[PDB]
Amino acid sequence: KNPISPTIPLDRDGVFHGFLKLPHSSAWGSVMIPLTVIKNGAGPTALLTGANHGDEYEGPVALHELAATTSAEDVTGRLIIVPAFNYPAFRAGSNLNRSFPGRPDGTVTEKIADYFQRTLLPMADLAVDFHSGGKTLDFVPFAAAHIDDKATQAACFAAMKAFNAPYSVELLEIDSAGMYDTAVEEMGKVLVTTELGGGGSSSARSNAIAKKGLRNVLIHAGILKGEMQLDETVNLTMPDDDCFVFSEGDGLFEMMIDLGAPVAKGDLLARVWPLDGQPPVEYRARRAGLVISRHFPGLIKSGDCVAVVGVT
């Protein structure tokens, strides 16, 4: 019933670069989601999606590289690579993430979600969903697993530990309704998500974390050939709303602590300087742990998250 058709085969051996197309129609147009499929021999299937927003780049870079530099002989199984997952542009730098599960006779965004929900996701054994902070937030580079209700948690935790980013976060929040990550979690699939930076930029460190983590997870999954890279990692949890500090006003934003630095309950996280003589507003940690996220831009607004602290 769903009118989305790939310009390539999903089922044949080789390297294939194409699109998902729905004419949305004197057709006056179509939307095209770029995708690469690499299948060879026998094995599981990885569904890799780059970014839900246009200001995240670690994901899009790693997936562009993987899609361009991986041959069929390297794969045992199948990779479905969607470097850009941000409606409507579907290009890095340029609402689909609340339209799940969607419907075949619906919005353009619900037709796309219905395709991922009822065609792509069921045939996937592993999902890797790259995020990054975007323009507003900057994170320490971490991979995250969702342990739930189910028994797949040991499989997700294992995929995250294979990723082996410098930080490993355990989230037992099941994400809000309509999101893609919620669809994977609630289908019981193995899902690893990331936050590999932010600020609308990507360094060679964070790019390298993404490429290594991608290869590790695909090798661990038995899809890619090779030897894994394992470095140190710090395991973190966000168990309480006391991990989050929100700004109550606007001003010039002065962060006082290192991203990644230790912080005790009561320490000063940031100052907000008023732009109309008065002293600055102070924002202090409500729990001890590590600063894992911070407001990135120089100005901050009421309601913005000042910083996030991860425990142990």
100 vs 110: CA distance, rounded Å: 7
- For the chain, the residues before each gap (C–N > 2.5 Å) are 25, 94, 276
Which structural technique was applied? X-ray
46 vs 128: CA distance, rounded Å: 8
Q: Does 24 appear as a known binding residue?
A: no
- Count CB atoms within 10 A of the CB of residue 279: 8
Q: Does 295 appear as a known binding residue?
A: no
160 vs 194: CA distance, rounded Å: 9
Residue type, 260: G
Phi, psi of 52 (to 5 degrees): -85, -10
Name 13's Cβ contacts closer than 8 Å, sequence gap at least 6.
39, 40, 41, 72
Domain that holds residue 91: 1-312
What would the DSSP string read from start to end of the chain?
Answer: ----EESS-SSSSEEEEEEEEE--------EEEEEEEEEESS--EEEEE--SSTT--HHHHHHHHHHHH--GGGBSEEEEEES---TTT-STT--GGG--S--TTS-HHHHHHHHIIIIITTT-SEEEE----TTTEEE--EEEEE--SSSTHHHHHHHHHHH--SEEEEE-PPPPTT-HHHHHHHHT-EEEEEE--BTTB--HHHHHHHHHHHHHHHHHTTSB-S-------EEEE--SGGGEEE--S-EEEEE-S-TT-EE-TT-EEEEEE----PPPEEEE-SS-EEEEEEE-SSEE-TT-EEEEEEB-
Name 54's Cβ contacts closer than 8 Å, sequence gap at least 6.
86, 89, 91, 92, 93, 94
301 vs 305: CA distance, rounded Å: 9
Whether the CB-CB separation of 86 and 52 falls below 8 Å is answered with: yes
Return left, alpha or beta for 219; rule: phi > 0 is left, psi -120 to 50 is alpha, else beta: alpha
18 vs 67: CA distance, rounded Å: 11
167 vs 197: CA distance, rounded Å: 12
How far apart, in Å, do the first and last CA atoms of the chain sit? 49
Q: Does 53 appear as a known binding residue?
A: yes
Q: Tokens 């927003």 label which residue? A: 53
Distance of CA 83 to the CA centre of its chain: 11
219 vs 168: CA distance, rounded Å: 18
Task: Give resolution, Å, one decimal.
Answer: 2.0
- Please state the domain count of the chain: 1
Residue 303 is part of a domain; what is its CATH number?
Answer: 3.40.630.10
Structure-block tokens of residue 268: 């000063």
Whether the CB-CB separation of 165 and 144 falls below 8 Å is answered with: no
94 vs 103: CA distance, rounded Å: 26
Whether the CB-CB separation of 251 and 280 falls below 8 Å is answered with: yes
Whether the CB-CB separation of 213 and 194 falls below 8 Å is answered with: yes
Q: Does 195 appear as a known binding residue?
A: yes
